Design a binder for this molecule. Structure first.
Ligand SMILES: Nc1ncnc2c1ncn2[C@@H]1O[C@H](COP(=O)(O)OP(=O)(O)OP(=O)(O)O)[C@@H](O)[C@H]1O
Length: 497
């Protein structure tokens, strides 16, 4: 085969082949500074020698604390070329999360700038990366780790997820079943290196010989700045949370921007419902760019299913995540541990080449979350199958509560609220009204240009759910408060109430 993706079994070999084949092509750009594949390849080789001198060796985990930028990408390639895995540290982490990630992962060095109180003292500064810029071992194998990304810590300590070269290759080999990507694309490098969206941005581009456009620091703050850069730099592929897309749409329409240079907008991270999509579709259509909903998790290498948005999508009121990539086997599993009848909701279980090998130093959790039956991963997500094989995303599987004599599926209530045409987000929790008097309440976000009242939402909910599932109060917020991992800050919602 001529295809470098099919022919290579690790990311370093893939990169080197793509670079050597056409090394003058642009791999990465920062403003007008264009770094060719050849330049990037030599630069990262020089940085790798620097890491070898700090003792980095195959199997090491090297911390990375940098903004997404050219230096950060060189540092990733350098770490990988040493046969090591990178452990990205979000610059905005609470100090305690960064402290835990570094202790947990046993990081033996850090590239970039250490956080305040950082226990890793073996450091290669950003300046030392820049110094290698224009200079002149077997490398990793399929089964070696490429990175360790940590889950958000919703349920307990952040879980460290080691992802292998073979895992990433399997995702990259699967992408062309949904996407038409080529070497002429320009991908915006946007997300924190600590998010696995970043992994997709980087390798989506490198695996096809495409260019990674770096979002400049000056443009990091507003969607107007964001649009200005993507349009000016000829970006063709962007990756967004549905929430970011709301603000993007609003800035594009109001600013009269031309978005039609984009070929794909790819969503991940959150439910995507039609009220979030209809205004873009109204202004711009669904062809240029194509919009593609994506569902995935760190444990199964970034993305699992995709659904390209169509007119039909806009005409229904659920979040449809679509069909699994070709590497995956799937089950939808009841509470008794057995499959469910097609059409009914159960826990999504996943099998295949994209599954990680388990958590880092968590034998107990790994046995639980990665059962043999064929090895599976339990997502902790509820889904239901459509009569095509497409999945609808229902909610998290751990949101059943006991209240006032009922078991209550909060995810069901959230889903019912999100069916409303003028709602774009919602979270249902329990709060105290009078001592010993706890009730369901719902904080929600109205779509731009609307103002749905508590009375109207109550009226909508009573057509869908039994009275024991009715939120007792509604609270309109300008947006839901979020954590650094973007997970909705439930301490903050409490305070809002
Ligand atoms: N496209 C999507 N639609 C809806 N929800 C999503 C989507 N993508 C991710 N999520 C939610 O985010 C979760 C991934 O978050 P993360 O890896 O931080 O795990 P967590 O459960 O939040 O944290 P922890 O596992 O540490 O308790 C998914 O299981 C899913 O519930």
């Amino acid at each position: 085969t001529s295809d470098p993706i099919a022919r290579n079994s690790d990311l370093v070999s893939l990169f080197r082949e793509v670079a050597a084949t056409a090394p003058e092509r642009t791999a990465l750009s920062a403003e007008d500074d264009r770094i060719s594949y050849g330049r990037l390849d030599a630069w990262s080789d020089a940085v790798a020698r620097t890491l070898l001198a700090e003792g980095v060796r195959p199997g090491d985990r090297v911390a990375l604390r940098m903004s997404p930028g050219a230096e950060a990408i060189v540092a990733i390639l350098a770490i990988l070329k040493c046969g090591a895995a990178y452990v990205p540290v979000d610059l905005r982490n609470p100090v305690s999360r960064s402290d835990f990630i570094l202790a947990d992962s046993g990081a033996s060095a850090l590239i970039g700038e250490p956080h305040e109180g950082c226990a890793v003292t073996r450091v290669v500064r950003t300046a030392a990366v820049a110094e290698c810029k224009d200079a002149e071992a077997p490398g990793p194998g399929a089964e070696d780790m490429a990175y360790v990304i940590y889950t958000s810590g919703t349920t307990g300590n952040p879980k460290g997820v080691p992802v292998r070269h073979a895992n990433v290759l399997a995702l990259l080999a699967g992408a062309p079943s949904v996407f038409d990507f080529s070497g002429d694309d320009r991908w915006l490098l946007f997300h924190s290196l600590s998010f696995d969206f970043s992994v997709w941005e980087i390798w989506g581009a490198f695996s096809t010989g495409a260019e990674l456009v770096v979002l400049p620091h000056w443009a990091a703050r507003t969607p107007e700045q964001y649009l200005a850069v993507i349009i000016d730099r000829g970006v063709t592929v962007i990756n967004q949370t549905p929430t970011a897309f709301l603000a993007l749409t609003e800035a594009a329409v109001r600013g009269g921007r031309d978005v039609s240079g984009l070929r794909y907008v790819i969503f991940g991270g959150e439910k995507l419902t039609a009220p979030m999509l209809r205004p873009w579709a109204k202004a711009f259509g669904l062809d240029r760019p194509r919009l593609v909903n994506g569902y995935g998790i760190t444990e199964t290498t970034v993305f699992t299913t995709f659904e390209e948005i169509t007119e039909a999508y806009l005409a229904q009121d659920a979040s449809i995540i679509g069909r699994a990539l070709p590497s995956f086997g799937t089950r939808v599993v009841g509470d008794d541990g057995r499959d469910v009848a097609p059409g009914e909701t159960g826990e999504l279980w996943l099998s295949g080449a994209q599954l990680a090998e388990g958590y880092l130093r968590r034998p107990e959790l790994t046995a639980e979350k990665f059962p043999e039956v064929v090895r599976y991963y339990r997502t902790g997500d509820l889904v239901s199958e459509l009569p095509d094989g497409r999945f609808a995303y229902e909610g998290r599987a751990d949101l059943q509560i006991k209240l006032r004599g009922y078991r209550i599926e909060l995810s069901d209530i959230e889903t019912a609220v999100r069916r409303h045409d003028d709602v774009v987000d919602a979270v249902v929790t329990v709060r105290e009204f009078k001592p010993g008097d706890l009730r369901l309440v719902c904080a929600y976000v109205a779509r731009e240009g609307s103002a749905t009242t508590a009375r109207e939402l109550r009226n909508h909910i009573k057509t869908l759910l039994p009275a024991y599932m009715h939120p007792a109060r509604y609270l309109p917020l300008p947006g839901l408060p979020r954590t650094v991992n973007g997970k909705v800050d439930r301490a903050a919602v409490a305070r809002s109430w």
